[PDB]
Protein backbone atom coordinates (compact mmCIF):
# COMPACT_ATOMS: atom_id res chain seq x y z
CA UNK A 1 0.00 0.00 0.00
CA UNK A 2 1.08 3.50 -0.88
CA UNK A 3 2.77 6.17 1.31
CA UNK A 4 -0.48 8.16 1.73
CA UNK A 5 -2.14 5.27 3.57
CA UNK A 6 -1.84 4.96 7.35
CA UNK A 7 -0.96 1.37 8.02
CA UNK A 8 2.37 0.98 9.63
CA UNK A 9 3.94 -0.61 6.73
CA UNK A 10 2.41 1.38 3.94
CA UNK B 1 -3.79 11.01 16.48
CA UNK B 2 -1.91 14.33 16.26
CA UNK B 3 -2.95 17.24 18.50
CA UNK B 4 -5.53 15.19 20.37
CA UNK B 5 -6.07 14.36 24.02
CA UNK B 6 -6.55 11.30 26.18
CA UNK B 7 -10.06 9.81 26.18
CA UNK B 8 -12.01 8.65 29.22
CA UNK B 9 -13.92 5.38 29.71
CA UNK B 10 -17.19 5.06 27.79
CA UNK B 11 -16.60 8.01 25.44
CA UNK B 12 -15.93 5.79 22.40
CA UNK B 13 -17.33 2.32 23.24
CA UNK B 14 -17.34 1.21 19.57
CA UNK B 15 -13.56 1.69 19.16
CA UNK B 16 -11.56 -1.51 18.75
CA UNK B 17 -7.84 -2.22 18.45
CA UNK B 18 -6.94 -4.66 15.65
CA UNK B 19 -3.68 -6.31 16.66
CA UNK B 20 -1.59 -9.18 15.34
CA UNK B 21 0.42 -11.71 17.15
CA UNK B 22 3.07 -13.66 15.38
CA UNK B 23 5.93 -13.99 17.81
CA UNK B 24 5.33 -10.50 19.12
CA UNK B 25 2.03 -8.61 19.50
CA UNK B 26 1.35 -5.16 18.02
CA UNK B 27 -1.47 -2.78 17.28
CA UNK B 28 -1.93 -2.32 13.55
CA UNK B 29 -5.29 -0.61 12.96
CA UNK B 30 -8.48 0.77 14.42
CA UNK B 31 -11.99 -0.43 13.75
CA UNK B 32 -15.58 0.28 14.77
CA UNK B 33 -17.96 -2.23 16.29
CA UNK B 34 -21.14 -1.83 14.24
CA UNK B 35 -23.03 -4.90 15.44
CA UNK B 36 -22.65 -7.69 17.96
CA UNK B 37 -20.45 -9.76 15.62
CA UNK B 38 -19.30 -7.13 13.08
CA UNK B 39 -16.40 -4.69 12.94
CA UNK B 40 -16.01 -2.05 10.21
CA UNK B 41 -12.45 -1.04 9.23
CA UNK B 42 -10.26 -0.11 6.23
CA UNK B 43 -9.40 -2.58 3.45
CA UNK B 44 -5.77 -1.42 3.43
CA UNK B 45 -5.35 -2.80 6.96
CA UNK B 46 -5.15 -6.20 5.35
CA UNK B 47 -2.49 -5.49 2.73
CA UNK B 48 0.16 -7.75 4.27
CA UNK B 49 -1.47 -10.99 5.64
CA UNK B 50 -5.33 -11.56 5.31
CA UNK B 51 -4.79 -15.00 7.05
CA UNK B 52 -6.79 -14.16 9.87
CA UNK B 53 -5.47 -16.43 12.74
CA UNK B 54 -2.95 -13.79 13.55
CA UNK B 55 -5.52 -11.18 14.55
CA UNK B 56 -6.57 -10.25 18.04
CA UNK B 57 -9.33 -7.71 18.32
CA UNK B 58 -9.62 -5.86 21.54
CA UNK B 59 -12.82 -4.13 22.58
CA UNK B 60 -13.64 -2.58 25.88
CA UNK B 61 -10.09 -1.35 26.18
CA UNK B 62 -9.27 2.36 26.88
CA UNK B 63 -5.57 2.04 27.67
CA UNK B 64 -3.50 -0.50 25.69
CA UNK B 65 -0.73 -0.91 28.27
CA UNK B 66 -3.60 -2.32 30.37
CA UNK B 67 -3.64 -5.38 28.03
CA UNK B 68 -2.18 -8.60 29.48
CA UNK B 69 -2.16 -12.33 28.69
CA UNK B 70 -5.55 -12.65 30.46
CA UNK B 71 -7.32 -9.79 28.63
CA UNK B 72 -10.13 -11.24 26.52
CA UNK B 73 -10.12 -10.64 22.77
CA UNK B 74 -12.14 -11.54 19.70
CA UNK B 75 -10.94 -13.69 16.81
CA UNK B 76 -11.85 -13.40 13.14
CA UNK B 77 -14.41 -15.69 11.48
CA UNK B 78 -14.64 -13.91 8.11
CA UNK B 79 -13.04 -10.92 6.34
CA UNK B 80 -15.06 -9.18 3.63
CA UNK B 81 -12.98 -6.69 1.65
CA UNK B 82 -14.83 -4.53 -0.87
CA UNK B 83 -14.63 -6.39 -4.19
CA UNK B 84 -13.54 -3.25 -6.10
CA UNK B 85 -10.76 -2.20 -3.67
CA UNK B 86 -7.39 -2.12 -5.45
CA UNK B 87 -4.41 -1.29 -3.20
CA UNK B 88 -2.67 0.92 -5.66
CA UNK B 89 -5.73 3.04 -6.37
CA UNK B 90 -7.25 3.42 -2.95
CA UNK B 91 -10.94 3.58 -3.85
CA UNK B 92 -13.46 1.60 -1.78
CA UNK B 93 -11.11 1.38 1.21
CA UNK B 94 -13.58 -0.47 3.41
CA UNK B 95 -13.75 -3.92 4.96
CA UNK B 96 -16.00 -5.91 7.27
CA UNK B 97 -14.75 -8.32 9.92
CA UNK B 98 -17.05 -11.01 11.30
CA UNK B 99 -16.05 -12.07 14.83
CA UNK B 100 -16.00 -15.76 15.85
CA UNK B 101 -18.43 -15.06 18.70
CA UNK B 102 -20.94 -12.26 19.33
CA UNK B 103 -20.06 -9.71 22.02
CA UNK B 104 -22.30 -8.77 24.92
CA UNK B 105 -22.94 -5.02 24.97
CA UNK B 106 -21.67 -2.92 27.89
CA UNK B 107 -21.13 0.77 28.51
CA UNK B 108 -17.53 0.25 27.20
CA UNK B 109 -18.36 -2.14 24.37
CA UNK B 110 -21.32 -1.04 22.18
CA UNK B 111 -21.89 -0.52 18.45
CA UNK B 112 -21.70 2.89 16.72
CA UNK B 113 -24.78 4.10 14.83
CA UNK B 114 -24.64 4.10 11.02
CA UNK B 115 -25.97 6.77 8.62
CA UNK B 116 -28.59 6.23 5.96
CA UNK B 117 -27.69 5.57 2.37
CA UNK B 118 -28.12 9.20 1.31
CA UNK B 119 -27.13 12.01 3.70
CA UNK B 120 -25.18 15.25 3.65
CA UNK B 121 -23.04 16.34 6.59
CA UNK B 122 -23.88 19.87 6.83
CA UNK B 123 -25.54 18.88 10.07
CA UNK B 124 -22.26 17.32 10.99
CA UNK B 125 -20.65 20.24 12.63
CA UNK B 126 -19.21 18.29 15.57
CA UNK B 127 -16.91 15.50 14.36
CA UNK B 128 -14.17 13.59 16.16
CA UNK B 129 -11.49 11.08 15.15
CA UNK B 130 -10.03 8.55 17.59
CA UNK B 131 -7.23 6.02 17.74
CA UNK B 132 -3.95 4.83 19.20
CA UNK B 133 -1.86 5.96 16.20
CA UNK B 134 1.22 8.18 16.14
CA UNK B 135 0.99 11.60 17.80
CA UNK B 136 3.40 12.95 15.15
CA UNK B 137 4.94 11.94 11.83
CA UNK B 138 7.68 9.49 12.58
CA UNK B 139 6.14 9.00 15.96
CA UNK B 140 4.93 5.94 17.98
CA UNK B 141 1.70 4.23 19.05
CA UNK B 142 -0.02 5.88 21.99
CA UNK B 143 -1.22 3.93 24.99
CA UNK B 144 -4.45 5.76 25.88
CA UNK B 145 -7.02 6.15 23.14
CA UNK B 146 -6.63 9.64 21.67
CA UNK B 147 -9.47 11.90 20.53
CA UNK B 148 -9.39 14.98 18.35
CA UNK B 149 -12.11 17.37 17.13
CA UNK B 150 -11.74 18.11 13.38
CA UNK B 151 -13.99 20.03 10.94
CA UNK B 152 -15.25 18.37 7.77
CA UNK B 153 -14.11 20.04 4.56
CA UNK B 154 -15.94 20.10 1.22
CA UNK B 155 -14.73 17.65 -1.44
CA UNK B 156 -14.11 20.66 -3.74
CA UNK B 157 -11.64 22.17 -1.24
CA UNK B 158 -10.17 18.74 -0.52
CA UNK B 159 -9.62 18.13 -4.24
CA UNK B 160 -7.57 21.35 -4.47
CA UNK B 161 -5.07 19.96 -1.95
CA UNK B 162 -4.77 16.69 -3.77
CA UNK B 163 -4.24 17.28 -7.51
CA UNK B 164 -2.61 13.89 -7.88
CA UNK B 165 -5.80 12.02 -6.90
CA UNK B 166 -9.03 11.32 -7.19
CA UNK B 167 -11.43 12.81 -4.43
CA UNK B 168 -14.76 11.08 -5.11
CA UNK B 169 -18.29 11.39 -3.68
CA UNK B 170 -17.52 8.16 -1.77
CA UNK B 171 -14.87 9.97 0.30
CA UNK B 172 -15.14 12.62 2.99
CA UNK B 173 -12.34 14.94 4.04
CA UNK B 174 -11.59 16.61 7.36
CA UNK B 175 -8.84 18.83 8.69
CA UNK B 176 -7.52 22.30 9.49
CA UNK B 177 -5.99 24.64 6.99
CA UNK B 178 -3.21 25.36 9.46
CA UNK B 179 -2.83 21.65 10.24
CA UNK B 180 -1.79 20.34 13.64
CA UNK B 181 -4.77 18.07 14.27
CA UNK B 182 -5.25 14.86 12.28
CA UNK B 183 -5.20 11.06 12.23
CA UNK B 184 -1.83 9.44 11.65
CA UNK B 185 -0.11 6.08 11.23
CA UNK B 186 -1.86 3.40 13.33
CA UNK B 187 -5.24 5.16 13.12
CA UNK B 188 -6.29 3.37 9.88
CA UNK B 189 -9.73 1.84 9.89
CA UNK B 190 -10.84 3.77 12.95
CA UNK B 191 -13.93 5.96 13.18
CA UNK B 192 -14.71 9.49 12.16
CA UNK B 193 -17.83 10.11 14.27
CA UNK B 194 -20.16 13.08 14.43
CA UNK B 195 -22.57 14.08 17.18
CA UNK B 196 -25.95 15.25 16.14
CA UNK B 197 -28.75 16.00 18.62
CA UNK B 198 -27.01 14.01 21.29
CA UNK B 199 -26.47 10.82 19.16
CA UNK B 200 -23.11 9.78 17.70
CA UNK B 201 -22.84 8.10 14.33
CA UNK B 202 -20.20 6.91 11.99
CA UNK B 203 -19.50 9.25 9.11
CA UNK B 204 -16.06 8.10 7.94
CA UNK B 205 -13.40 5.41 8.12
CA UNK B 206 -9.83 6.69 8.53
CA UNK B 207 -8.05 6.06 5.20
CA UNK B 208 -5.28 8.33 3.86
CA UNK B 209 -3.58 11.73 3.75
CA UNK B 210 -0.23 13.31 3.08
CA UNK B 211 1.87 12.84 6.11
CA UNK B 212 0.06 13.78 9.32
CA UNK B 213 -1.34 17.12 10.40
CA UNK B 214 0.39 19.07 7.64
CA UNK B 215 -0.95 22.46 6.70
CA UNK B 216 -3.43 22.40 3.92
CA UNK B 217 -3.36 18.62 3.72
CA UNK B 218 -6.60 17.31 5.10
CA UNK B 219 -7.31 13.70 6.13
CA UNK B 220 -9.31 11.59 3.70
CA UNK B 221 -11.92 9.14 4.96
CA UNK B 222 -14.13 6.53 3.35
CA UNK B 223 -17.66 7.98 3.41
CA UNK B 224 -19.73 5.31 5.18
CA UNK B 225 -23.14 6.56 3.89
CA UNK B 226 -22.06 5.67 0.34
CA UNK B 227 -21.41 2.02 1.30
CA UNK B 228 -24.51 1.38 3.38
CA UNK B 229 -26.11 -0.77 0.67
CA UNK B 230 -22.89 -2.82 0.58
CA UNK B 231 -22.70 -3.08 4.39
CA UNK B 232 -26.31 -4.24 4.64
CA UNK B 233 -25.97 -6.74 1.78
CA UNK B 234 -22.75 -8.34 3.04
CA UNK B 235 -23.77 -8.63 6.70
CA UNK B 236 -27.31 -9.92 5.96
CA UNK B 237 -25.95 -12.41 3.41
CA UNK B 238 -23.25 -13.66 5.79
CA UNK B 239 -25.71 -13.89 8.70
N1 LIG C 1 -5.20 11.54 8.14
C2 LIG C 1 -4.07 11.14 7.80
N3 LIG C 1 -3.10 12.01 7.72
N4 LIG C 1 -3.84 9.87 7.54
C5 LIG C 1 -4.90 8.90 7.59
C6 LIG C 1 -4.45 7.60 8.20
C7 LIG C 1 -3.27 7.05 7.47
C8 LIG C 1 -2.17 8.06 7.64
C9 LIG C 1 -2.55 9.41 7.07
Instruction: Return the active site residues of B.
Output: 44, 93, 188
Residue B127 bridge partners (DSSP): B194
CA distance linking residue B47 with residue B238, whole number of Å: 23
Closest chain A residue to B205, measured at CA: A6
Contact (CB, 8 A) for B32 and B9: no
Q: Is B46 exposed, middle or buried (0-12, 13-18, 19+ CB in 10 A)?
A: buried
Task: Write out residues 3-32 of B within 8 Å (CB-CB) of A.
Answer: 26, 28-29
CA distance linking residue B178 with residue B215, whole number of Å: 5
Fill in the DSSP letter of residue B112. P
Does the beta carbon of B184 sit less than 6 angstroms from any atom of ligand 1?
A: yes
Contact A1 B209 (CB under 8 A): no
CATH number for the domain formed by residue range(s) B13-111+227-239? 2.40.10.10
Method: X-ray
Main-chain phi, psi angles of B145, to 5 degrees: -55, 120
Contact (CB, 8 A) for B38 and B98: yes
What does B150-163 look like in DSSP terms, one character per residue?
A: --EE-HHHHHHH-T
Residue B129 bridge partners (DSSP): B148, B192
The alpha-carbon radius of gyration of chain B (Å, integer) is 16
Query: Which strand ranges, in their side-by-side order, compose the sheet holding B76-81?
Result: B55-58, B15-21, B25-35, B38-41, B95-99, B76-81
Residue B85 bridge partners (DSSP): none
Q: Where are the alpha helices (DSSP H) in chain B?
A: 155-161, 228-238
Ligand 1 atom nearest to CA at B187? 6
Q: Are strands B152-153 and B5-6 parallel, antiparallel or unpaired?
A: unpaired
Closest chain A residue to B187, measured at CA: A6
Residue B35 bridge partners (DSSP): B38
CA distance linking residue B115 with residue B229, whole number of Å: 11
The length of chain A in residues reads 10
Q: Where are the beta strands (DSSP E) in chain B?
A: 5-6, 15-21, 25-35, 38-41, 55-58, 76-81, 95-99, 127-131, 146-149, 152-153, 171-174, 191-196, 199-208, 219-223
User: Between A and B, how many residue pairs show a Cβ–Cβ distance under 8 A?
Assistant: 47
Contact B208 A9 (CB under 8 A): no
3-class SS letters over B198-223: CEEEEEEEEEECCCCCCCCCCEEEEE
B197-217 per-residue burial string, b: 16 or more CB within 10 A, e: under 16: eeebbbbbbbbbbebbbbeeb
Domain positions in chain B? 1-12+112-226, 13-111+227-239
- Give the number of other Cβ atoms within 10 Å of residue B221's Cβ: 27
CA distance linking residue B9 with residue A2, whole number of Å: 34
**What is residue B195's three-state secondary structure?**
strand
CA distance linking residue B208 with residue B103, whole number of Å: 30
Contact (CB, 8 A) for B96 and B39: yes
Fill in the DSSP letter of residue B64. G
CATH number for the domain formed by residue range(s) B1-12+112-226? 2.40.10.10
Asked if domains B1-12+112-226 and B13-111+227-239 share a fold, the reply is yes
CA distance linking residue B22 with residue B55, whole number of Å: 9
Task: Write out residues 40-59 of B within 8 Å (CB-CB) of A.
Answer: 42, 44-45, 47-48
Amino acid sequence: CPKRFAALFC
Amino acid sequence: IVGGTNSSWGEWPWQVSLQVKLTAQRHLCGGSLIGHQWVLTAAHCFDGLPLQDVWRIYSGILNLSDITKDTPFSQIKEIIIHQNYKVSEGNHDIALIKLQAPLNYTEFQKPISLPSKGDTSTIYTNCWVTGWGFSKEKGEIQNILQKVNIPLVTNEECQKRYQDYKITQRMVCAGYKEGGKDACKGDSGGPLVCKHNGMWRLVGITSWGEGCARREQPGVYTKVAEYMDWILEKTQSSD
